[PDB]
Design a protein around this ligand. Structure first.
Ligand SMILES: [Mg+2]
Ligand SMILES: [Mg+2]
Ligand SMILES: [Mg+2]
Ligand SMILES: [Mg+2]
Ligand SMILES: [Mg+2]
Ligand SMILES: [Mg+2]
Ligand SMILES: [Mg+2]
Ligand SMILES: [Mg+2]
Ligand SMILES: [Mg+2]
Ligand SMILES: [Mg+2]
Ligand SMILES: [Mg+2]
Ligand SMILES: [Mg+2]
Ligand SMILES: [Mg+2]
Ligand SMILES: [Mg+2]
Ligand SMILES: [Mg+2]
Ligand SMILES: [Mg+2]
Ligand SMILES: [Mg+2]
Ligand SMILES: [Mg+2]
Ligand SMILES: [Mg+2]
Ligand SMILES: [Mg+2]
Ligand SMILES: [Mg+2]
Ligand SMILES: [Mg+2]
Ligand SMILES: [Mg+2]
Ligand SMILES: [Mg+2]
Ligand SMILES: [Mg+2]
Ligand SMILES: [Mg+2]
Ligand SMILES: [Mg+2]
Ligand SMILES: [Mg+2]
Ligand SMILES: [Mg+2]
Ligand SMILES: [Mg+2]
Ligand SMILES: [Mg+2]
Ligand SMILES: [Mg+2]
Ligand SMILES: [Mg+2]
Ligand SMILES: [Mg+2]
Ligand SMILES: [Mg+2]
Ligand SMILES: [Mg+2]
Ligand SMILES: [Mg+2]
Ligand SMILES: [Mg+2]
Lengths: 159, 127, 185, 222, 58, 51, 172
RNA sequence: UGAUAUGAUGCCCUGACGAGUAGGCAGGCGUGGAGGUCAGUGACGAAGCCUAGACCGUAAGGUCGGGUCGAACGGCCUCUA
RNA sequence: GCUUUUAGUGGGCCAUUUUUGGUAAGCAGAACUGGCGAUGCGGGAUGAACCGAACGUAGAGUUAAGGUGCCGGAAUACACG
């Protein structure tokens, strides 16, 4: 009959990254987490303790607790037509600080600067982001570059 | 003599008769709506009878008006009849079916006096 | 056709008139839809709606609950408005003076109000003294202190109070309510 | 009370000022438009003179028509069609072209026809089938006060102020464009020109971006 | 008499009628599941600063 | 009560857009354009007629 | 596909920082309108060079009219096409008064004789044959003889009325 | 809500929308009996029945004429099965 | 945005794409979507599921998919083979 046990289906998911097996480098343990931090969940197959269930692989969430070897992470998992709050106890080997907010934090700090520098000159800011715009007109020169004329080519084989 | 109205449009003048009321005597013409699972009528298959729906409802302006333009109002006696005294361009009296012949001559008489229209004056007339 | 993004012919879901058949109530509404239409004062809109409320959505306001609201610093001289009935609270020993506009006052509640030298005003009387609802304090009763609400949301680990007729031990206290028998909730 | 001709004069006189402002504005736009067109014409000529090639700025504005009926549509395009406010057949709206819209158009290509509208067809779209959304309620335009009332805070006190905001894709294009109810077009009076519609334009069909050929279509549907 | 075994067919039409309601974020989320030693100290910590701000309005 | 098309009704055409009067008057829709004779470079014509 | 026009289409890869002014390629395309023509360009361009519309730019589009539209020409024509069971190169000769008219009947011919639709054909070359007796296929050579004259036997006049009172004559 | 005229659940302006089994709800039609009312109808003809005659209603149904008939019966506000 | 309460249902079937068993099946079993079931209307002669298009009562216009020798509304139309 069917087999649904805890780690079922996880063969390549928890696999180790080619020529990356062995001890986990020490920086993983030197990193520091605080409540509110945003972390990414990726299981480390070499660490059997404190392991995320496969559903939370590739999932990002927030730290609600900090403990000796571990951090608690809340995740919104959707079951049915709704989301429920999930609380995960994970060891620090399966967690990584997320860069998902990095550009935003960067963009804020840069925005404050441009805004002060603007006020201190005068007004004229425009700090909202804008989508790719269509190109403006342009003039392309034929000097040194005269159009080469191409035709489609006949059927061949070379086997 | 009737209050002026827009042209009266009836919009479906044909009677809505029960499906198969024409097929079996046991089925009256009175409208009744098909609940059947397979029924072609309930499913509106092209070629069948049409069913009542609110779209057919008459214009609020001319609704209830008769050909003459008056709304008809049932009348038992003179007192009833006199409730139309101030509206003769709106309502017409229809004399109740059970009013006696001799009484009908009195209602008609007062009707004339008041200029109130009567829809069935020839009823029970001794002639 | 239209690919409809929203359900068609949907009633707003809000009361329009009260469901009540009482003339006097229907007159007060007559008063306040007028007031709400012409005064631009937000108070009148809030009152007009409240009159539509069914008995459950208008819990009584205690006379002691009133007394507490005038202890807000700055509010002592405002006239409290209760759209609903006012009930007496035996367990306050000193009631301020003030003024209360209500739909109903219980015998003992208006007595207490009146014995401190206060006033009991009907909402139409309040209307004439304060067409814009000036200097008014609106009080609402505790809706969810009702008994039925205890049983709402019943389920495993919800802490929510079973619908039950008899109580005491050996009524729905054993398997599922304690670690010893089966499991617990 | 006076008010007889008294506040009728204070009104009529003020009405005359607004028409005046509108005259010199529409007079300006006309100058703007034709010297913009002349300038591109001469750009192209001067480039050939230089032995070069003048390439135009890619279009910043397109006009989409829903070409497909309401049933049997996959959910993803279906949402997009809603977000672009095309919920029934032959109804159409204006779209500003950026990466984050152009990708939307991509998703709905099989169900719509679109291209680059000329000043001419924008003008006749609005004068005839142009309506505003005012407390919903789809109000016909028909008088300039209706616009000034609702779009006034952005500038835009006339019907041609509107048109100008659309075609130039102005700073206030979002508010201008959303103000206009989706246009309700009839079927084309010529017909579709193709034997079957639900092929792409390039394949002999009606859908996707037919570019400047959108004007011939819409004008026959308007 | 065998019959259908299982399907997800139509299940997401249903889910989407009233649904897929976003998580409903709150300011001040619950402390549930937080380390007890921390919470114990946090408790006294708050009591002290509470007393402190009442000493400001003394 | 009944919508009137500016493009068919000169009354309301002039109601919206007062510029319509001078547009029609200065004739404006048929405007002639300045005549210039600038000519295309040999490179342009050569590559046009190229193979 | 339609009544054809011939377009010059010129395009290039988008300018990079380290490669501004990329190399400018041209194709001559037969299409009914500029929308199809630009499409076809990118079609063959992606078959040759590393580009696609998204990373490229159309520099110029231009229609090329016949130099001598009233002069009769013998066109040699070169084509690649797909059959049901394989793909093949052909050479046909067409005689007409403009390139654009020639490509019209080519496409008709490929449809009629080899059952090739428009998608399945590549025009390899179209070029005027300058000296007669470089003319190869004889369904053309036939028409190059001196003092050429032929009749049109058995002529059918189209009737405008359903009935006729005469009986007809095919004389010409 | 402004009286001095007649519906405030009313009256007036405006916009959008209309498929439907199982099923929910709403507003209405019709019947036997009950409280109230119109000092209701009737032996100078109640009720009933007949009638490719008439009229009102989208409809359930309502109203009239004519024929037959012979002792009782109906409108409205409410109650009830 | 939020709360309560309750019906029916808990035999399903089909189409494009992915796809398992089977020589195969108008066979048996999954995936995503769209459909039929509950749904008429135009087209495919005919037909649950295809194409087009989703329905209040109507007037005028224009179209879709599909057609225009005659049955049958609409060129015994034009053009190259
Ligand atoms: Mg297994
Ligand atoms: Mg262990
Ligand atoms: Mg039945
Ligand atoms: Mg049937
Ligand atoms: Mg059935
Ligand atoms: Mg209690
Ligand atoms: Mg024991
Ligand atoms: Mg838009
Ligand atoms: Mg026509
Ligand atoms: Mg024509
Ligand atoms: Mg066809
Ligand atoms: Mg038109
Ligand atoms: Mg079984
Ligand atoms: Mg079976
Ligand atoms: Mg089953
Ligand atoms: Mg089983
Ligand atoms: Mg319905
Ligand atoms: Mg009704
Ligand atoms: Mg009843
Ligand atoms: Mg009864
Ligand atoms: Mg009748
Ligand atoms: Mg009658
Ligand atoms: Mg009789
Ligand atoms: Mg009788
Ligand atoms: Mg007897
Ligand atoms: Mg009753
Ligand atoms: Mg339920
Ligand atoms: Mg049940
Ligand atoms: Mg249930
Ligand atoms: Mg059940
Ligand atoms: Mg399908
Ligand atoms: Mg099967
Ligand atoms: Mg069934
Ligand atoms: Mg269905
Ligand atoms: Mg259907
Ligand atoms: Mg399809
Ligand atoms: Mg036949
Ligand atoms: Mg015919």
């Amino acid at each position: 009959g069917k087999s649904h046990g805890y780690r079922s289906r996880t063969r390549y998911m928890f696999q180790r990254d080619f020529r990356k097996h062995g001890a986990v480098h020490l920086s993983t343990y030197l990193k520091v987490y605080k409540v509110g931090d945003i972390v990414d969940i990726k299981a480390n197959g070499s660490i059997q303790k404190g392991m995320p269930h496969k559903f939370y692989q590739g999932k990002t969430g927030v730290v609600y607790n900090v403990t000796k070897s571990s951090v608690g992470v809340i995740i919104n998992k959707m079951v049915g037509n709704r989301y429920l709050e999930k609380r995960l106890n994970l060891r620090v080997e399966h967690i990584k600080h997320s860069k998902c907010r990095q550009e935003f934090l960067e963009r804020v700090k840069a925005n404050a600067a441009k805004r002060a520098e603007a006020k201190a000159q005068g007004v004229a800011v425009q700090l909202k982001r804008q989508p790719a715009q269509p190109r403006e007109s342009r003039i392309v020169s034929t000097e040194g570059n005269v159009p080469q004329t191409l035709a489609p080519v006949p059927y061949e084989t070379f086997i | 003599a009737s209050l002026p109205h827009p042209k009266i449009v009836k919009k479906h003048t044909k009677k809505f008769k029960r499906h198969h009321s024409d097929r079996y005597h046991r089925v009256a013409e009175n409208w009744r709506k098909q609940k059947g699972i397979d029924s072609v009528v309930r499913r509106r298959f092209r070629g069948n009878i049409s069913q009542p729906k609110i779209g057919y409802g008459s214009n609020k302006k001319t609704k209830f008006l008769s050909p003459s333009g008056h709304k008809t109002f049932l009348v038992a006696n003179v007192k009833d009849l006199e409730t139309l005294t101030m509206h003769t361009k709106t309502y017409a009296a229809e004399i109740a079916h059970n009013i006696s012949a001799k009484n009908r001559v009195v209602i008609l008489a007062r009707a004339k006096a008041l200029g109130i229209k009567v829809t069935n004056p020839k009823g029970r007339l001794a002639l | 056709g239209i690919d409809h993004t929203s359900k068609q012919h949907k009633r707003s879901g809000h009361r329009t008139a009260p469901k009540s058949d009482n003339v006097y109530l229907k007159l007060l509404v007559k008063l306040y839809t007028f007031l709400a239409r012409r005064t631009d004062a937000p108070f009148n809109k809030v009152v007009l709606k409240a009159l539509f409320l069914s008995k459950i959505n208008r819990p009584p306001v205690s006379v002691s609950r009133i007394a507490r609201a005038l202890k807000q610093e700055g509010a002592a001289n405002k006239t409290v408005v209760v759209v609903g009935t006012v009930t007496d609270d035996a367990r306050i020993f000193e009631f301020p003076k003030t003024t209360v506009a209500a739909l109903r006052f219980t015998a003992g509640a208006r007595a207490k109000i009146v014995k401190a030298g206060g006033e009991c005003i009907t909402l139409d009387q309040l209307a004439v003294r304060a067409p814009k609802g000036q200097n008014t304090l609106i009080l609402r009763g505790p809706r969810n202190s009702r008994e039925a609400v205890r049983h709402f949301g019943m389920g495993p680990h919800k802490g929510k109070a079973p619908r039950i007729l008899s109580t005491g031990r050996k009524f729905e206290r054993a398997r599922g309510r304690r670690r010893s028998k089966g499991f617990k909730v | 009370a006076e008010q007889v001709a008294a506040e009728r004069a204070a009104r009529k006189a003020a009405n005359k000022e607004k028409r005046a402002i509108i005259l010199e504005r529409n007079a300006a736009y006309q100058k703007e438009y034709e010297t913009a067109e002349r300038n591109i014409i001469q750009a192209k000529r001067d480039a050939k003179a230089a032995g070069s090639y003048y390439v135009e700025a890619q279009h910043k504005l397109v006009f989409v028509v829903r070409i497909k009926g309401i049933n049997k549509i996959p959910p993803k395009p279906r949402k997009v069609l809603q977000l672009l406010r095309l919920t029934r057949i032959n109804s159409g709206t204006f779209v500003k072209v950026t990466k984050a819209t152009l990708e939307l158009l991509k998703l709905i290509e099989p169900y719509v026809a679109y291209g680059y509208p000329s000043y001419s067809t924008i003008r006749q779209l609005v004068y005839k089938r142009g309506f505003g959304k005012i407390n919903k309620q789809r109000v016909p335009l028909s008088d300039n006060a209706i616009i000034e009332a609702n779009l006034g805070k952005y500038g835009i006190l006339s019907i041609d102020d509107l048109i100008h905001e659309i075609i130039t894709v102005g700073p206030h294009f979002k508010q201008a464009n959303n103000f206009l109810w989706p246009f309700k077009l009839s079927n084309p009076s010529g017909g579709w020109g193709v034997p079957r519609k639900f092929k792409h334009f390039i394949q002999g069909g009606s859908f996707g971006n037919r570019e400047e050929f959108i004007n011939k279509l819409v004008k026959s549907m308007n | 008499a065998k019959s259908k075994n299982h399907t997800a067919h139509n299940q997401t039409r249903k889910a989407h009628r009233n649904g897929i309601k976003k998580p409903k974020t709150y300011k001040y989320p619950s402390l549930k599941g937080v380390d007890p030693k921390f919470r114990r100290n946090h408790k006294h910590a708050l009591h002290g600063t509470a007393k402190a701000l009442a000493a400001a309005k003394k | 009560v009944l919508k009137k098309n500016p493009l068919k009704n000169k009354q309301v055409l002039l109601r919206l857009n007062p510029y319509a009067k001078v547009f029609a008057a200065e004739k404006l829709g048929s405007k002639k354009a300045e005549k210039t004779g600038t000519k295309p470079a040999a490179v342009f014509t050569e590559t046009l007629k190229h193979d | 596909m339609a009544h054809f026009k011939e377009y010059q289409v010129i395009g290039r890869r988008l300018p990079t920082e380290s490669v501004p002014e990329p190399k400018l390629f041209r194709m001559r395309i037969f299409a009914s309108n500029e929308v199809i023509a630009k499409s076809r360009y990118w079609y063959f361009l992606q078959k040759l060079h590393k580009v696609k519309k998204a990373s490229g730019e159309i520099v110029s589009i231009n229609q090329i009219n016949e130099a001598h539209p009233t002069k009769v020409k013998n066109f040699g024509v070169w084509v690649r096409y797909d059959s049901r069971s394989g793909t093949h190169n052909m050479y046909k000769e067409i005689r007409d008064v403009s390139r654009v008219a020639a490509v019209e009947t080519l496409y008709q011919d490929m449809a009629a004789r080899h059952r090739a639709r428009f998608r399945s054909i590549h025009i390899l070359k179209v070029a005027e044959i300058e000296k007669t007796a470089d003319v190869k296929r004889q369904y053309v050579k036939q028409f190059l003889t001196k003092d050429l004259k032929f009749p049109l036997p058995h002529r059918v006049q189209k009737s405008t009325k359903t009935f006729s009172y005469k009986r007809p004559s095919t004389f010409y």
